[PDB]
Amino acid sequence: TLFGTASTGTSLFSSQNNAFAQNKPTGFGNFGT
């Protein structure tokens, strides 16, 4: 009754977001001007 094990490797500029219960997770937003 669980997620499990989620990994990443050798990744430049990288964001993971881990939860049991996420509401609206996001990838980056706003780079540059």
Report in angstroms how near the CB of residue 2 gets to its own copies at its nearest: 5
Note whether 16 and 8 are within 8 A (CB). Answer: yes
Residues 1-33 that bind its own copies (CB under 8 A): 1-33
Report in angstroms how near the CB of residue 4 gets to its own copies at its nearest: 5
Show the tokens assigned to 17. Answer: 């977001």
Note whether 17 and 8 are within 8 A (CB). Answer: no
Report in angstroms how near the CB of residue 26 gets to its own copies at its nearest: 5
List residues near its own copies by CB under 8 A.
Answer: 1-33
